[PDB]
Amino acid sequence: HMSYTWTGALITPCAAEESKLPINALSNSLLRHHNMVYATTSRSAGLRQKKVTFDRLQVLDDHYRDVLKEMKAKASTVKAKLLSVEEACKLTPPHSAKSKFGYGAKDVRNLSSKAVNHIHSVWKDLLEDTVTPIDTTIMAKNEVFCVQRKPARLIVFPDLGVRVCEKMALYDVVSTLPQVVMGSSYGFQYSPGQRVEFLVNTWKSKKNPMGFSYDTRCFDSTVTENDIRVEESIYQCCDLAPEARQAIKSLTERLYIGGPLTNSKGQNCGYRRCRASGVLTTSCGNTLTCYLKASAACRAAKLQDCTMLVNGDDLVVICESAGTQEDAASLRVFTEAMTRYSAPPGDPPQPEYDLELITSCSSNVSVAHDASGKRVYYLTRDPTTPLARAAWETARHTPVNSWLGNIIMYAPTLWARMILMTHFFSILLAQEQLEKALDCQIYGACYSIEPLDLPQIIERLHGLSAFSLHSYSPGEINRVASCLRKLGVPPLRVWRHRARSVRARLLSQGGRAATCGKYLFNWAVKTKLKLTPIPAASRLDLSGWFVAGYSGGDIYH
């Protein structure tokens, strides 16, 4: 029951790949320790192949089937619509991988006759054939990290025409079903602020709280054919059009369960019998399967008054403590049950008794103080990876601007405000690119965002307090200082000085730019301004933001 079989053919690149941090005139103003930053390339794909390849055994008991029956009962309340070819075309990112059949992402977006006709023929083939494995491309992802080197992650995706078909059959399912099936436990329905609110309230709701995060080792490779057929049975509980039922069955049999792996050069690399990392259902399938196995493992471990929070393969549980020793025994039982279900751990879970020490979705809750001095809970994370990626983005234009997604998601943080806002607004001003729309990712979906809209986006997502936070926690301050020293990032005095300069440059431009100066950089001045609601913030259509997860899902807005 191997996750993969391989032919020995290489996972090849599409274009020239760089691994060493590129340097320009701006790099040193951010980070001095260049040798610590690297990008993964196809060269290390061979090592990832080794890591993702293993036998899966699955032993399913009554706790598993009981949870599954409950999930199916909730899924039966969902009604989902079939999207038209045109609606599905409009969800395609403009830089999405081109079809092998003579059309690209812009052709799909423009509803070009060639693309639309090819999609209709893929759709007809899905309804008529429910057996033939669909071809997929396997690529090494090019991602930036800080040392201590990891091999490249792999992306497995079907052709562009198939991806539009997945959206037609399943977009509405994957956007609606998880919140119905999992309720308050579905993490992707929350903005960072709402996630913090749910974690704090959950923690406070326990008499003696204990929390832990569970890291499954290579979650996608642990997903078996059973798990994928179980996910299909959940989707099939929905009230669906007969064409959607047929397309979902066909996509499950031909694509979701497994299929051949083709490199960028057209050679056969092997065969997948686990979750594809680049399909529409990657996020929803992972969340449901992680929730199903974890809920059943919570029952096997006899965890008391359990609240789970699930985002794909990322899981956090907050429950009633039975004291340190018994909590450790309970987590070993939880782990044994997850292993029997084919979700063994990477790092073994550790019980935590301080909410701030729980890391989930590489994030944690922390506390600061607003202008009035009130305690404010907010979401933060270790700044290492965001700062390493920012260094790369300082010297190279990338398809996804992580700095922009990071400011959006982590706007109240000491590091996003002091460093990211200051560094990138300085660059945008100098190039007169404040008004240029940039791509970024939020919960895996792609958004085109104008940096001038940032104050309004931040106010809508985090509130006005995000522009006034101070008196950060000692743990947070220590982590940020430690990261600046490790990467060779300049100290506060330098960032405060650059921020006053950036603020001054923005203020004189007036309009939206002055608003960026006034709101984003109020922390940098001696005589702070009275920050009041921005009128334009009401007009922003933020619907579709924080509804569901789409990592690997090829979704645009």
Per CB under 8 A, which of residues 44..73 are in contact with a second copy? 70, 73
Which residues are within 8 A (CB) of 311 and not within 5 positions of it... i.e. 6 or more apart?
187, 188, 287, 360, 361, 443, 549
Site for a second copy (CB under 8 A): which residue of 2, 17, 19, 26? Answer: 26
Q: What does 50 interact with, of ligand HJZ, a second copy, none (CB < 5 to 8 A by kind)?
A: none
Residue 260: CA atoms inside 13 Å, Cβ hemisphere, count? 13
DSSP H/E element including 426: helix 422-430
CA-nearest of 417, 408, 402 to 476 is 417
First to last CA, the chain: 38
- 472 binding ligand HJZ? (CB under 6 A): yes
Query: What are φ and ψ of residue 100, in 5° steps?
Result: -75, -15
Q: What are 10's two structure tokens?
A: 């290489």
Cβ-based nearer residue to a second copy, 215 or 320: 320
Instruction: Give the binding range for a second copy (CB under 8 A) out of 98-106, 136-144, 380-388, 503-511.
Output: 98-106
Please answer whether residues 238 and 346 qualify as being in contact, where contact means their C-beta atoms are separated by less than 8 angstroms.
no
C-alpha–C-alpha distance, residues 275 and 162, integer Å: 16
The contact pattern for a second copy, residues 215-254, with x = CB under 8 A and - = no contact, is: -----------------------xx---------------
Select the residue interacting with ligand HJZ from 357, 430, 477, 504 (CB under 6 A): 477
The region of 197-205, 318-326, 442-450, 517-525 touching a second copy under the rule CB under 8 A is: 197-205
Its sign, for the CA torsion 463, 468, 474, 479, is positive
Among the residue ranges 317-325, 350-358, 443-451, 471-479, the one whose residues contact ligand HJZ (CB under 6 A): 471-479
Least CB distance to a second copy at residue 140 (A)? 13
Q: Which stretch binds ligand HJZ (CB under 6 A): 164-172, 215-223, 287-295, 465-473?
A: 465-473
Q: Are 134 and 216 in contact (CB under 8 A)?
A: no
Of the candidates 62, 341, 34, 353, the one whose C-alpha atom is nearest the C-alpha of residue 209 is 353
Name the binder of 246 from ligand HJZ, a second copy, none, CB < 5-8 A by kind. none
Of the candidate residues 48, 275, 340, 417, the single one contacting ligand HJZ (CB under 6 A): 417
Position 208 contacts a second copy (CB under 8 A): no
Let me know how long the chain is: 557
CA distance 451 to 429: 11
Which CB atom, from 195 or from 417, has the smaller least distance to ligand HJZ?
417
Q: Which entry of ligand HJZ, a second copy, none binds 471, CB below 5 to 8 A by partner kind?
A: ligand HJZ
Tokens 């071809």, residue? 135
Contact residue for a second copy among 84, 117, 448, 532 (CB under 8 A):
532
| The one among 128, 131, 375, 526 contacting a second copy by CB under 8 A | 375
Find the shortest distance in angstroms from Cβ 477 to ligand HJZ.
4
Amino acid at 124: K
Question: Per CB under 8 A, does 29 bind a second copy?
Answer: no
* Of the candidate residues 117, 121, 201, 233, the single one contacting a second copy (CB under 8 A): 201
Tokens of 58: 């699955």
Q: What is the DSSP string of 220-249?
A: HHH--HHHHHHHHHHHTTSB--HHHHHHHH
For position 306 contacting a second copy by CB under 8 A, the verdict is no
Per the annotation, binding residues for Mg(2+) are 215, 313-314
Q: Which residues contact 149 (CB under 8 A, 6 or more apart)?
A: 38, 40, 44
List the single partner that 488 binds among ligand HJZ, a second copy, none, CB under 5 to 8 Å by kind: none
Please report whether residue 266 would count as binding a second copy according to CB under 8 A: yes
Minimum CB–partner distance for residue 176 and a second copy (Å): 9
Breaks (C-N over 2.5 A) in the chain follow: 148
Q: Which two tokens stand for residue 447?
A: 């958004």
Beta carbon of residue 265, minimum distance to a second copy (angstroms, whole number): 5
**Residue 371 interaction partner, one of ligand HJZ, a second copy, none, beta carbon < 5-8 Å per kind:** none
Sheet harboring 4-6: ordered strands across? 4-6, 268-272, 259-262, 136-140, 154-157
Q: To 10 degrees, what angle do helices 474-487 and 384-395 make?
A: 40
Our finding on whether 481 is near ligand HJZ (CB under 6 A) is: yes
For the record, the structure tokens of 507 come out as 């203020």
Q: Which residues contact 354 (CB under 8 A, 6 or more apart)?
A: none
Contact set for ligand HJZ, span 523-542 (CB under 6 A): 523
Query: Where along the sequence are the contacts to ligand HJZ (CB under 6 A)?
Result: 414, 417-418, 470-472, 477, 480-481, 492, 523
Query: Where along the sequence are the contacts to a second copy (CB under 8 A)?
Result: 10, 12, 16, 23-27, 70, 73-74, 76-79, 101-102, 104, 106-107, 180, 183, 201, 204-205, 238-239, 265-267, 374-375, 397, 430-432, 464, 532-533, 538, 543
